[PDB]
């Protein structure tokens, strides 16, 4: 039937409170929902006469399905400029945020049913992970009967600067995201 996520949760109230200096890692939520209309998101529904229009809708709707089956977000219904201005992040930060975002569907409801007119409602829950330290260039360590053991498992080299990074409790997505990283000499 219906699953659940249990436990009390902290909430950020207005959206621009994500960037502060007094909150730590965790799952944070928004007080109010975001209401969206499909007929208002598409900027080219008009100026398409005859049967053509329905084809357009079909195509777009199909695309949405091809997104939601793979646990990914289709951004045609979410303006990028609004979120970018609210978060005040850089272009690369926006790219890495949008690439590693996952979605979920938790209720699909049919309200009005008839032989000519129909209406549907879909609930979508997203999760965005903002970054704190991004590492692009990195090398992986192999050890090659004496066997000297080491604490560091990844090494970084950029801008004539070398760092040693150790990872633990790490999950895998299209990119590699993890929470516990400490620089060790």
């Amino acid at each position: 039937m219906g699953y659940a996520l249990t436990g009390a949760v902290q909430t950020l109230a207005q959206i621009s409170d994500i960037n502060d200096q007094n909150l730590q890692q965790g799952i944070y939520l928004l007080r109010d929902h975001i209401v969206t209309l499909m007929e208002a998101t598409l900027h080219d529904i008009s100026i398409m006469p005859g049967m053509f229009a329905v084809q357009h809708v079909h195509t777009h709707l199909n695309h949405l399905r091809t997104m939601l089956m793979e646990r990914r977000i289709d951004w045609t219904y979410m303006s990028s400029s609004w979120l970018q201005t609210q978060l005040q992040k850089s272009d690369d930060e926006m790219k890495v945020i949008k690439r590693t975002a996952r979605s979920l569907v938790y209720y699909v409801k049919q309200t009005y049913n008839s032989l000519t007119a129909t209406a549907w409602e879909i609930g979508l829950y997203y999760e965005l992970i903002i970054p704190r330290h991004i590492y692009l260039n990195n090398w992986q360590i192999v050890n090659i009967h004496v066997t000297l053991s080491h604490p560091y498992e990844i090494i970084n080299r950029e801008c004539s600067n070398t760092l040693y990074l150790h990872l633990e409790e790490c999950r895998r997505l299209d990119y590699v995201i993890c929470d516990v990283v400490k620089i060790v000499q």
Binding site: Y3, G26, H33, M48, V54, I177
Partner: protein, 99 residues
């Protein structure tokens, strides 16, 4: 040519980038689709609308059939002021009464 790998450690490339986790945000979006609104703009004929409604219902049933429901602890989206305005406008915007 023979070289000695220093200090007993060798290294290979790892193309995957690394990201350090920070505060993780989540937001909820409710999307409402109405066939009548898109029908009006298209100047769409009666039989064509009868086709369009079935075309929409097939995809909607296909999407709703392959997913189970969960529980987001935010609350009831009914009481939101914005949702009230949007729901009134979606269906009841252009109706009037004359006496």
């Amino acid at each position: 040519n023979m070289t000695s790998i220093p200090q007993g450690v060798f290294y290979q490339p790892h193309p995957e980038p690394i990201i350090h986790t920070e505060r993780v945000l989540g937001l909820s979006q409710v999307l409402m689709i109405n066939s009548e609104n898109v029908a009006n703009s298209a100047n769409l004929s009666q039989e064509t609308k009868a086709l369009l409604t079935e075309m929409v219902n097939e995809e909607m049933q296909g999407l709703s059939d392959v997913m189970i429901d969960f529980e987001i602890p935010l609350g009831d989206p009914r009481d939101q002021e914005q949702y009230i305005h949007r729901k009134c406008y979606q269906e009841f915007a252009h109706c009037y009464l004359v006496k």
